[PDB]
Structure 1
């Protein structure tokens, strides 16, 4: 089965934006979130990775707009950002999205996260936001502002709890067009039976072909942000590339 592509729509104040390594001063803007989402759908997206960046950064919410976007889309939505308790989880799922991602909550409230995993199964994936410094793989929460512990210990815990799916980002590569971290992706995929979704750094069609070589090891999909918005390549080119 080919690598699934998930065009990203990261939302700040109703707008589709990109950042370089999550920094405030690096923001590029690409029109309304709804137009971005419908545009990728028109180009053939099977999935949209829809993120509330304001919620992720704890500075506000785009929930009502995101609910409208999910409602308007025919294709499947992976919704993320600020899902950290029973209210926010239920509100996300009530949009009718295909699944959600929790990130910070896996680091800060492992007990809640385990119970959510146990009751929601395939509708909840966990985002692992990784920073590697001197070979030390650390997780980051709260818009990458906090340390969330050792990647490998947390990965094993979530795997033992029956976590359905992992979304793995190298925060150093995110929004850089510097290429994906194939070693990190393989490392995670080899240490869980759960499918892995690659996120961050894709810069070319060759980058997608490289990720596609990991599909047999557990890398089921790839989230693509900047490369699409910055027009490095088109979605149909990308869809064709993961098959060639």
Structure 2
């Protein structure tokens, strides 16, 4: 039952955007979101994590592009970014994506969040952005509440899935936060998707040690562009 890898495609201005490591150093590279997604699929991705960063900041939507990516893909898409109300949720689902992620809305509109969880079940996952200040696990994103408190509320509301990021300043410095991942996974019956803190295959292997504990997958972002490993290498590293 291997860890599912979800290569990320981040979308700004209708284009894919990534932080890349070239020979000379880091820079921001744009490309076609279709190209990036199809590339991952051919590399062996069964899931793409598609993020509308314009929507995430209300600076626009890339709805038609998002739909084109979902449509052209033969594999499944998890869609995220600015999914906050009835209108934006409908629009996200209208892309034909397998499921969506709700984030800040869980901290901002708990009742709407509970309503859409009940309505859409497995089509809705909640992103938990966790800051760790002096031992305390807090939620924030774009204070936002106690992590364990909000996790319990969401678990009891029937939340089907959680996406867990440690956003603590320098908290993913020595690799992914397995304590937090295992922390969340132990407190809910819902599967947990790891996001952030991945810079190597070893980081993925480490996350993979928690599959039997409820860590279903890992979103892989810029690490795929760091010229350290390929998606096929990553997929192979977690299956064996």
Question: Normalising by structure 1, what TM-score?
Answer: 0.91
Q: Distance in 1 between matches of 2:171 and 2:219?
A: 12
On the 8 A contact 1:102/1:125 being kept in 2, the answer is: yes
Q: Tell me which moved more, 9-18 or 196-205.
A: 9-18
Cα deviation, residue 173, structure 1: 7.1
Q: Distance in 2 between matches of 1:111 and 1:235?
A: 38
Q: Distance in 2 between matches of 1:62 and 1:24?
A: 32
Q: Distance in 1 between matches of 2:48 and 2:3?
A: 14
Distance 1:102 1:221, change over 3 A: same
Cα deviation, residue 171, structure 1: 1.6
Distance 1:69 1:24, change over 3 A: farther
Distance 1:186 1:55, change over 3 A: same
On the 8 A contact 2:67/2:95 being kept in 1, the answer is: yes
On the 8 A contact 2:8/2:50 being kept in 1, the answer is: yes
Cα deviation, residue 172, structure 1: 3.5
Deviations 1:43-90 (A, max 9, x none): 110000000011112222212211111111110000011111111111
SS in 2 for 1:231: coil
Q: Distance in 1 between matches of 2:25 and 2:228?
A: 22
Cα deviation, residue 22, structure 1: 20
Work out the number of aligned pairs and report it: 240
Distance 1:25 1:140, change over 3 A: farther
Q: Tell me which moved more, 52-61 or 208-217.
A: 52-61
Q: Which residue of 2 aligns with 1:198?
A: 194
SS in 1 for 2:25: helix
Unaligned runs of 5+ in 1: none
On the 8 A contact 1:50/1:80 being kept in 2, the answer is: yes
Distance 1:64 1:23, change over 3 A: farther
On the 8 A contact 1:196/1:220 being kept in 2, the answer is: yes
Unaligned runs of 5+ in 2: none
